[PDB]
């Protein structure tokens, strides 16, 4: 998924009311159109029935733009994309960046040449009417008693520090400090967050250790100290491209409000 639009309210039953005599009626959506009453049954005035938008009934709808997976692409080709539409009770189940096997009906619809003219282009735009999502890259008292028994194990501190980063060699005190950071101090200015700095030559184990440990905790973040960072350290304000309104894009330090922030090339 590349982008996921706002929740679109799509009408499913139009509520009409007479402006003269307050008589009300309800009409179903035929194929997206409305069969407007044209005359009020209780007072026979023509063109007196007015659509009350908020008394009408709406379902949820959302547009999702889906790009083919990188491994499926041909050699050196730019991605193809398809448009998905997900309706009520299946609407907000996917986020940008995730991977899915999506099942739906391959629709083809006409698109009007101009918003004020009913002529349609001969070439039909296509989209997927989504029926099912299956995410493919996202993945008790027994746990409590196992953890409680494990806490009494001899040299459990060394055991957990050794379990940290199996690919990395010999860095015992570094792993011990990282473990104490990941556990943290007692919350209650009484800052309980432990700050750790790794220092050494480029190409050494510290970058691998950061890239490992950031995904080992909830609420964690990883970012670069350089300007090429995907999520910057500083908060900033930008125009949200899909709607061109201001949005307060907070930085990684703020998004990791109760977790570890791994700052590489610090």
């Amino acid at each position: 998924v590349i982008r996921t639009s706002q929740l679109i309210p799509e009408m499913q039953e139009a509520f009409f009311q007479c402006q003269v005599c307050a008589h009300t009626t309800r009409v179903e959506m035929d194929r997206g159109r409305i069969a407007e009453p044209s005359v009020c049954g209780r007072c026979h005035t023509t063109h007196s029935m007015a659509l009350i938008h908020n008394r009408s009934l709406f379902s949820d709808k959302q547009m999702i733009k889906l790009q083919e997976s990188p491994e499926d692409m041909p050699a050196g080709q730019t991605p193809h994309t398809v448009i998905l539409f997900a309706h009520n009770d299946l609407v907000d189940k996917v986020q940008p960046g995730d991977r899915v096997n999506v099942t739906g009906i391959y629709r083809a619809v006409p698109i009007r040449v101009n918003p004020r003219v009913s002529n349609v282009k001969s070439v039909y735009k296509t989209h997927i009417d989504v029926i099912h999502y299956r995410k493919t890259d996202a993945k008790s008292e027994k746990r409590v008693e196992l953890l409680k028994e494990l806490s009494r194990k001899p040299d459990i501190y060394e055991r957990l520090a050794s379990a940290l980063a199996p690919s990395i060699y010999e860095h015992e005190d570094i792993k011990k400090g990282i473990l104490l950071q990941l556990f943290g101090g007692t919350r209650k200015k009484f800052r309980a967050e432990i700050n750790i700095l790794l220092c050494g030559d480029p190409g050494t184990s510290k970058s691998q250790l950061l890239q490992y440990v950031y995904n080992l905790v909830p609420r964690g973040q990883y970012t670069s100290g350089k300007g090429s960072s995907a999520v910057g350290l500083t908060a900033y304000v930008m125009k949200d491209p899909e709607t061109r309104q201001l949005v307060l894009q907070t930085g990684a330090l703020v998004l990791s409000d109760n977790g570890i922030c791994c700052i590489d090339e610090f």
């Binding site: 005599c21 307050a22 008589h23």
Partner: protein
């Protein structure tokens, strides 16, 4: 004129009325008129005294106070809020006219705080 003095003279009346909304109107008027504070009597009468000021037009009402008044009324307001809201404003207008100093054209508004 005869006892049949009404030819519908000048009438374009509402041939039907929203029953649920008008019941909500009268019951909310009763709530504003009868719900009382623990340290006194008739809280929202005292709070509605402030609406005679030129800038003030909104009465802030506690939804939990409405629940303490009646649960069915509170559920109906919560479920049918946008439908019934102008009727609640008319109820507030009927309640606040007893201060006697309001302009005739002044609108009044209800604002529900403390939603659980």
């Amino acid at each position: 004129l005869a006892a049949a003095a009404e030819p519908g003279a000048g009438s374009q009346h509402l041939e039907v009325r929203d029953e649920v909304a008008e019941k909500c109107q009268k019951l909310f008027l009763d709530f504003l008129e009868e719900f009382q504070s623990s340290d006194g009597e008739i809280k929202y009468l005292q709070l509605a005294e402030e609406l005679i000021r030129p800038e003030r037009n909104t009465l802030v009402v506690s939804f939990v106070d409405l629940e303490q008044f009646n649960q069915q009324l509170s559920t109906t307001i919560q479920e049918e809020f946008y439908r019934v809201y102008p009727y609640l404003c008319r109820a507030l207008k009927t309640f606040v006219k007893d201060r006697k100093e309001i302009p005739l054209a002044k609108d009044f508004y209800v604002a529900f705080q403390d939603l659980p």
